Design an enzyme around this catalytic site. Structure first.
Site, PDB file in Angstrom:
ATOM      1  N   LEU B  30       0.823  -1.205   0.000  1.00  0.00           N
ATOM      2  CA  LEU B  30       0.000   0.000   0.000  1.00  0.00           C
ATOM      3  C   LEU B  30       0.860   1.259   0.000  1.00  0.00           C
ATOM      4  O   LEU B  30       0.592   2.203  -0.753  1.00  0.00           O
ATOM      5  N   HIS B  31       1.916   1.283   0.819  1.00  0.00           N
ATOM      6  CA  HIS B  31       2.794   2.445   0.885  1.00  0.00           C
ATOM      7  C   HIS B  31       3.741   2.557  -0.304  1.00  0.00           C
ATOM      8  O   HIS B  31       4.319   3.630  -0.510  1.00  0.00           O
ATOM      9  N   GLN B  32       3.923   1.487  -1.078  1.00  0.00           N
ATOM     10  CA  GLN B  32       4.747   1.537  -2.275  1.00  0.00           C
ATOM     11  C   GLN B  32       3.939   1.690  -3.553  1.00  0.00           C
ATOM     12  O   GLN B  32       4.508   2.061  -4.584  1.00  0.00           O
TER      13      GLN B  32
END
Lengths: 333, 189, 109, 305, 293, 49
Positions: B30-32
């Site tokens: 999700l953060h990438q």
RNA sequence: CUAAGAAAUUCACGGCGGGCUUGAUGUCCGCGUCUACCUGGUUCACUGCCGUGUAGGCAG
């Protein structure tokens, strides 16, 4: 007369330890620079999957077992990933002088046994036994599991007079059966060579090379050692394989048991197939003795009736008794 | 929580790791994905886990903005698990939400790496490195610290962010490109 | 048969106090799993990795090795399997192994 | 002979110079009558200020050592003595002999009182061992701290507490504090059993146990006997040899308020057992029971088998 | 009749140690000369393996023999029990072929279950599968392992042909040697995940590799017929059918969907279970193992 | 090495169940062997008298 | 309230001198060890990590 309380025979047809190497098919001509198959090591981890005692313990203990699996390290042996063809090579000496004991108390029992076996020999040669031995060389029994599921298997047998190949045989070990023993010209030539070796009328040294395609990198199956516990379970308290100077190998008694699968003449059937030649003629994998001693067909009963009291059995049971004398053993009391 | 959005999520199995690696790989993906295109205010939203339990959480509720964290399910290299669990699109989460500090938040989650690094390359001598790396200088805050299952540090540490503790009415805001609400109390789904 | 398990537990108790740390000894062939079947010290030396190897791993292999040693103490012939007295000996061996295992289950647990 | 509501494990007690004579016909471990009198002395001096009732005692005897020697060619043994102080003229003293030994015993005390609910278990245990550390147990000092008095805390355990799994579990957790131990019980019925066996010639019970702590070499038609256990002779109480007297009649008594009779002690049999072989622990305890109108004063372990 | 005290089954679908080699995408036809992936040191003291910095596409290659003769044991006390077991497995085969098991094995080959962590986070996976008699390509099958899901076994005709081949191999009607090549974009210089020895990484003659039993585990993830739940996913085929990560013994013997309970009911006392449970039992015999007392 | 039962059984206990159960426990053994190498075909034996 | 309550074993001492253990020897014959396996937390809510300072760009 009586039996000798200490009989002992020596092994005829003694093979070497077979060494495994690996290469590509259609390079079987240059199959002598081929690198060996090396017994490596890897770490496995698996669950508990055996037949646990049903309702020995609570299922929460089953759930706790899967939390704590065992982990062990094993020896494996694979082909190199470029190579698809195993090579298994050993040598065989067909010695001959088959009915002569190497330890014998009684002086009349030895004479009676040698007269009995000489009556067998001049009555009928070793051509039946050597024909079945030439089958078990031509089909690759000695590839035990390495033959099972192999695409193409070729056996090449060479006779070695001096540092020189005298006569070369080639076979298709899958077209030659595993159950029936049929007729062939080249196998009758090899059978009469092995029969001249067993009869004591010549020298036989064979070089037996088997070429089994499996595929690019698959597992081969050397024979397996048992583990002394000086080194820990980190350090193979699970599986050690047999080797030589860094090459995967099969024991000599494994090959020799693959050679003396003669015995179609046991009272169950031959539709099961031939089995090995043992006193109380048994199978380890079946876990049972064929040829029970309460039936009158084991080696000891047939031998004592044919030697001590001249009760010559049927011809095929004589082949069984002489095949147990070619096997060798510690007979007597 | 100060998170104005609530990223949709749903649990599922994963073959490349256990459920802890599943949660770490989900937060990292999700953060990438969402934090690889644009946006700063993509905070932290993972307050479904217990505070004193000291876990990272498993409740499928992303805590970012709409555009700042919506690209996690449409990552240019984030396939392989887009159909193995209940996925979705961006959405809006409740105002009361725990600022789960699984991100690049700045706190005393490491006395060795960050604390010893401020002792060594922060105008200090080795005495600052000795006073920076005690047992009370390396510990996570009251936030759901997702385990950084990527090429974040030399070892495989977590996404430690020592922020305000496990509560409901947090104050979130501007995170970084790594998606850090570890000092910004953000909501979630 | 009960005296053998009683004397073995008494020997384990009498050995499990003098040595402070039951370390892995060079030549511990029966001390592969007997490094926890013997005196397991959860000290600073025998740390949580020793307290977790002997914590989760139980001494069933010490129990199974002891049951094998009890079977191999006397010999094996046609009297241990060709009579009910050998059946009584086998039932007593199973009962003594179950009793020693139920004792050892409360040892680490 | 009441059933115990609890058990109290005085965990590890070094005894300094106890009495290793025990009877006119034994010499080993001291008489269990000393242990019964010890637990009764604890019942007197602190067992009433806690509103409890201490009756049973379980002997354990971890480590033993006696001050003996065998005199160099002789097969028997003699005792090591002490120098007493000199005479009134400073000549020398007449030597009487006393065997002395070093015990490491552990005591299991049965508790019956109503004060088990009024007091916490650790306060009961602490006050009992803190009193017993200033007493003596067979004429021998109970030793304080040594190199390895690490199991210093006493423990109290109610046997009735919990389920059957809980009771037997907590029992087998107690047996991990009796680790090299060997409990001493009474085996009177086995003495009568072997007497009824070999009572062909002489049914005298002295000959029976005088032929039990032994090796019995039978000959060719050598088949020495097999030992059923560690059977040892014990003293097992007192039997009277005089009519009982009033508290003022006997000259030179220990007091003038108790009746005194001259007695003879009464030999018995019992055998040492590991704490695994016993079923429970309430069956293991020694009790004193006397029939005072007759002269039968004895001690045993009632309700063992 | 009772059961055999010694039963043993030797495995079918035996794979090899797959070797990983890196390389760039659109070198995808000339992939035979790609350089391998090396296990190295970084710092602690661990061992990791990464692609070269100009290489984005991992390449995993292994072969697979589909043997056949699934019901026949290789160690057996009672010959009557063997006769009943062979009649039972022949009854299974004559009721229905191996084509359901063949389609689920071909689905585990058609996706990249053997790419365990290497698939999670990959933007294109292509699985090329060749059938090999001699050193030749008899028939080739290239795929798209992200469209063919890891979860829902859909319908496809190329999978039907490949399962016809695997079913002919499992019956005993042909020689099946499949070569499996799995390309997977991870990105340049990224991390691969080979399997881990007792922390070091498993290797061959200077290349990184996955153990053979791990890929054999990835192929027999079939068991969609639980007692527990028909909504989570397929797991592997085990007796006492278990997941180690989840820690739960699914298919517990306090239910009756167990392997040993099904096998004893259907061999000894002829209580033939449901058809999917028969697929489970024949899948545990294609797995092989040491059964019996 | 792993062998089987091939010795002359004493004919007072030679039952099919007894013999089959004897085969169920195969005697495992370890032996010392001495071979030639796979390329040598000659044994040299040397001593002084 | 215990076969209860009490207790200084002491000093000093030269074990020495010598010696041939030998001769002889066949350890032999035979053997199927198989069957199966995910080391997958992030080997750290952290080593290199704007402020070592619950604040942050942080090979996330």
């Amino acid at each position: 007369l009586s039996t000798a309380s200490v009989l002992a025979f020596e092994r005829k047809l003694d093979p070497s330890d077979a060494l495994m190497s690996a290469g590509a098919w259609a390079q079987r001509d240059a199959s002598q620079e081929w690198p060996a198959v090396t017994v490596r090591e890897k770490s496995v981890r698996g669950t508990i999957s055996n037949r646990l005692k049903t309702k020995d313990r609570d299922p929460a203990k089953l759930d706790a077992s899967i939390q704590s699996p065992n982990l062990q390290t094993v020896d494996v042996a694979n082909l190199p990933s470029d190579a698809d063809t195993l090579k298994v090579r050993f040598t065989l000496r067909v010695l001959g002088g088959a009915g002569t004991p190497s330890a014998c108390n009684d002086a009349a029992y030895r004479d009676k046994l040698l007269q009995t076996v000489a009556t067998y020999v001049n009555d009928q040669g070793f051509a039946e036994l050597a024909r079945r031995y030439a089958h078990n060389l031509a089909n690759a029994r000695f590839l035990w599991r390495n033959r099972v599921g192999a695409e193409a298997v070729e056996v090449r047998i060479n006779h070695i007079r001096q540092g020189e190949v005298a006569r070369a045989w080639r076979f298709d070990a899958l077209a030659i059966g595993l159950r029936d023993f049929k007729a062939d010209a080249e196998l009758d030539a090899l059978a009469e060579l092995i029969a001249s070796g067993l009869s004591g009328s010549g020298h036989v040294l064979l070089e037996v090379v088997a070429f089994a395609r499996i595929g690019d990198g698959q597992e081969v199956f050397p024979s397996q050692e048992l583990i002394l516990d000086k080194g820990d379970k980190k350090g193979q308290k699970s599986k050690t394989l047999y080797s030589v100077r860094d090459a995967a190998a099969i024991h000599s008694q494994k090959i020799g048991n693959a050679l003396r699968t003669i015995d179609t003449w046991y009272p169950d059937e031959d539709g099961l197939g031939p089995i090995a030649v043992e006193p109380y003629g048994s199978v380890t994998s079946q876990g049972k003795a064929y040829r029970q001693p309460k039936q009158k067909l084991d080696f000891y009963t047939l031998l004592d009736n044919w030697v001590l009291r001249d009760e010559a059995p049927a011809v095929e049971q004589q082949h069984y008794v002489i095949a147990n004398l070619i096997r060798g053993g510690v007979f007597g009391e | 929580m100060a998170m104005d959005h609530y990223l949709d999520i749903r649990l599922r199995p994963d073959p490349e790791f256990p459920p802890a690696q599943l949660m770490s790989v989900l937060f990292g993906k999700l953060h990438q994905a969402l934090v690889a295109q644009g946006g700063d205010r993509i905070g932290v939203s993972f307050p479904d886990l217990d505070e004193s339990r000291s876990r990272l959480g498993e409740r499928l509720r992303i805590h970012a903005s709409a555009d700042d964290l919506r690209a996690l399910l449409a990552r240019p290299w984030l396939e392989g698990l887009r159909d193995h669990l209940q996925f979705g699109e961006p959405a809006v989460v409740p105002h009361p939400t725990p600022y789960r500090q699984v991100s690049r938040v700045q706190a005393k989650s490491n006395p060795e790496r960050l604390r010893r690094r401020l002792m060594r390359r922060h105008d200090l001598s080795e005495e600052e490195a000795r006073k920076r790396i005690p047992d009370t200088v390396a510990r996570a805050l009251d936030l759901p610290f997702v385990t950084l299952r990527s090429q974040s540090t030399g070892q495989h540490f977590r996404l430690f962010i020592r922020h305000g503790p496990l509560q409901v009415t947090a104050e979130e805001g501007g995170f970084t490109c790594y998606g850090l609400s570890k000092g910004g109390f953000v909501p979630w789904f | 048969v009960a005296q053998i398990c009683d004397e073995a537990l008494q020997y384990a108790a009498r050995l499990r106090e003098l040595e402070p740390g039951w370390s892995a000894t060079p030549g511990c062939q029966l001390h592969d799993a007997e490094q926890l079947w013997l005196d397991p010290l959860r000290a600073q030396t025998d740390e949580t990795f020793l307290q977790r190897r002997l914590r989760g791993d139980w001494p069933a292999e010490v129990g199974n090795r002891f049951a094998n040693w009890l079977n191999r103490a006397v010999s094996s012939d046609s009297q241990i399997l060709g009579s009910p007295e050998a059946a009584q000996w086998s039932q007593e061996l199973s009962k003594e192994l179950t009793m020693f295992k139920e004792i050892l289950e409360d040892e680490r647990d | 002979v009441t059933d115990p509501e609890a058990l109290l494990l005085l965990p590890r007690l070094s005894i300094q110079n106890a009495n290793a004579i025990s009877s006119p016909l034994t010499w080993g471990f001291p008489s269990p009558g000393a242990f019964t009198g010890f637990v009764h002395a604890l019942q007197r001096r602190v067992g009433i200020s806690l509103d409890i009732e201490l009756d049973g005692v379980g002997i354990v005897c971890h480590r033993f050592e006696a001050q003996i020697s065998q005199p160099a060619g002789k097969r028997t043994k003699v005792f090591n003595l002490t120098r007493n102080p000199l005479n009134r003229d400073g000549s020398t003293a007449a030597i009487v002999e006393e065997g002395r030994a070093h015990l490491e015993v552990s005591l299991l005390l049965g508790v019956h009182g109503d004060g088990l609910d009024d007091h916490p278990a650790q306060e009961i245990a602490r006050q009992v061992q803190e009193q017993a550390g200033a007493m003596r147990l067979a004429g021998g000092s109970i030793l304080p701290w040594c190199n390895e008095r690490f199991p210093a805390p006493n423990a109290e355990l109610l046997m009735l507490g919990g389920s059957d799994e809980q009771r037997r579990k907590n029992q087998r957790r107690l047996t991990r504090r009796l680790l090299p131990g060997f409990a001493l019980v009474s085996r009177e019925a086995l003495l009568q059993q072997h007497l009824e066996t070999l009572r062909t010639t002489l049914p005298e019970a002295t000959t029976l146990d005088a032929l039990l702590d032994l090796c019995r070499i039978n000959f060719e038609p050598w088949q020495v006997r097999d030992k059923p256990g560690w059977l040892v002779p014990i003293p097992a109480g007192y039997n009277a040899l005089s009519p009982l007297y009033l508290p003022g009649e006997v000259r030179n008594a220990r007091d003038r308020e108790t009746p005194l009779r001259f007695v003879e002690n009464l030999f018995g049999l019992g055998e040492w057992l590991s704490p695994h072989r016993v079923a429970a622990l309430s069956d293991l305890l020694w009790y004193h029971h006397a029939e005072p109108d007759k002269g039968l004063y004895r001690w045993s372990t009632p309700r063992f088998v």
